Symmetry: none
Subunit: 247 residues, 4 copies
């Protein structure tokens, strides 16, 4: 009735794409047959109260399939995202490593999916966890994937948001992230450089590894720069490539 | 009209942290330290949140809220319980594992209570282990530079590093690096493990000499009478005395 | 920042209080009233304090903290429970019996949440029954002048009189005296019992004309669908419009 | 706590004196003079803030096994909030409150052992008591209720006893006899206060004993206080103790 979990296609994959407008949010939700989380960014609002009002309105248009975003990769939006999420109660929240537990605490329930941003390092098996407001300005803090997953679980997280993935430029690092998420019972949100031409290959890496639930994020490659909207036809194409792989 | 939510540091620099074995022991400790103490009561010593909250509220009132809510081993499986207890009790101080700092801060609902975060030696000065939570403590070690551990803890609402198990003076160089980093990066330090009356001044002086703004040494087993379970008030008086001789 | 702890009065004068039958109903009520409502959730619909706290915190988040913690038909046996629930939830509004107002205020720990106090008709305009607590409701009636009831409630941390059971307009002279006293002695008024769409304007206008500064009318059974137990959002829209017409 | 008990030391589970101390020395002398069957009053109005009252009162209490009674200083009602806040930290055996402060003090104490009285007053009509004794309510028209109801109200608000003040000694004898009868009938404690002196103490105490009130805490202030020093005379406390032993089997 007010659903707090995402609509995974055959309990495996849910798309995450950005809305350019309220009408675009509705377009996107229809194009994905509901198997999507529609991103709205906190950086687009000057203050928490302003964002709560507007994001509730978005959420109501799409049966709560909202993903609260940071925006422009800015970790300084973390606190705002946590406070917005408390009142909005969306299906999905994007956080930096140091904001996951705060968002989980302010949500007050375990149903909403809360990701935690960790980054490639150039060394398969090791990820950067120093992705918060001050920690992003410090020397890198880099830990094994197993350990990043356990840290995120201990902090109320649901998934790794692996960013910037670099499309297929760093295949070995991405393979290791998928292997670790499968081995340690955690979900994965691949983000950065995904487009219509590499989507199937990227998704299949995570499916083949045995990751239980996967939320690919597809931003700039499917956004019409003239309007700022995510293109419905591209959403339909992503859905069909997903159905072809998840069977 | 609420009770005070921040510790009573001696000359804005040092506050002792010691365990109570009883309500009367807590009163005697608080007197012996002239108020410059946080008295630890352990969540693991109660069967449920409600029994901890009721008892710890009473401890707190007797000592003007100079209560430190403990895990009870730095035990990470007590983390969620400590966060809920602390929410309801509203103490001056909370002990957390790395993965519980933000939860405790969020549930406290205010920025005054001091919340530590447990990070640990690695064998390599400058590098600390942050994988101290329930599941992370069983995973491969997650080790980061001190600057980064401090920034991570600040981002998560923490006030200080609880550096444990410090090993007394067995790993002096690692401890010196911790104190240096807390001074350089404007963070507080809570040295814990192996402190006794004979090494207290040396250990405290490392942190003072480094320039750490606020220091909360924890002194547990060496000052506890095993027959009663009480911290010895005379040992607290001596700890205060040694503190005064170094801080002026 | 914590959520807002005071009600959202329409033109600083009137805030509706109606009951939610579900989480969705709370959301619909809040929309229907354009935010000028306190959505009641009854303690009696939970078996224990924690159960109530967990659910009411979720209600509150969905409606920006515009929650009213209910006894359940003014039941004094729910008073202690409501005081502890309210301490943990931190709502905008609390319903209390006369002997629970101070306890709720003390446990809330702040003066922003509105706490009402139940006092009742006697048959004599100007005199109200204050013996509305668990044991005092079973004793001979304690009956005092309105001025005195107001001063007692203020002294005990109360914000308003909950005047119950008002009987719609059946005791209009007594209600007119309550409104006059609240205006004269600078206190708020919560008319409760027998309010419906046919008498609402007249009842509200008695309080408005008397000069009561803040009024929180409670409208329960007349606007509740018996099958679902939900307050009809259309009736909340109607109540809001009747309020706007009277509060220019 | 074990070393600082929260309930008064009643003589033969029946009577505990309540008198004011003018100094820590005077508190010790009083406590000795009463053989421990006393609550020593220290007044909130003698401190500029809660913090200073807490420090000093905690030191008083430590000298006398926690036999401390936190006072308003007048039955004064504007001290009510301060008394509640002091008591939260002091955790005394006894707290004086006005009618509107009983529940606040109980809530801030956090436990049910400390005795919290509630001031209610004569009306000229035996059986009826004035409950409007708080900061603003004391200035309103009188709120008068039956004794049964006043007791039930105080119980509902976490109270332990009625502080019946101002008694004017035996001036309100019939009213006081009815208060004692009601407290015995409704299982509540009684703290007679106002105008008690060495000449009327036995008769006043015996009214309450004869009625069957289960715990009685008489308050004896001005008649036993040396004005020049501000100290309660320990010799007067010894006399009051002996009068109590003569009446309590």
């Amino acid at each position: 009735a007010m659903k707090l979990t995402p609509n995974f296609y055959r309990d495996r994959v849910c798309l995450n794409v950005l809305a350019g407008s309220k009408d675009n949010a509705r377009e996107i939700y229809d194009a994905a047959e509901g198997h999507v989380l529609v991103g709205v960014l906190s950086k687009n609002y000057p203050d928490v109260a302003s964002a709560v009002v507007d994001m509730r309105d978005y959420a109501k248009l799409i049966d709560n399939a909202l993903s609260v975003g940071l925006g422009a990769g800015d970790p300084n939006q973390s606190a705002m995202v946590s406070e917005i999420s408390r009142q909005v109660q969306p299906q999905h929240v994007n956080q930096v490593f140091t904001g996951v537990a705060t968002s989980r605490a302010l949500l007050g329930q375990n149903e909403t999916v809360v990701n935690g941003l960790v980054s490639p390092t150039g060394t398969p098996g090791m990820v950067k966890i120093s992705t918060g407001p001050l920690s992003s300005g410090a020397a890198d803090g880099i830990v094994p994937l197993e350990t990043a997953i356990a840290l995120l679980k201990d902090m109320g997280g649901s998934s790794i948001k692996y960013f910037p993935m670099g499309g297929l430029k760093h295949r070995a690092e991405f393979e290791a992230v998928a292997k670790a998420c499968a081995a340690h019972d955690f979900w994965l949100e691949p983000t950065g450089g995904i487009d219509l031409e590499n989507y199937s290959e990227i998704l299949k890496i995570a499916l083949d590894a045995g990751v239980s639930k996967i939320i690919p994020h597809i931003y700039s490659s499917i956004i019409d720069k003239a309007s700022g909207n995510t293109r419905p036809a591209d959403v339909r194409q992503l859905l069909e490539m997903t159905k072809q792989l998840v069977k």
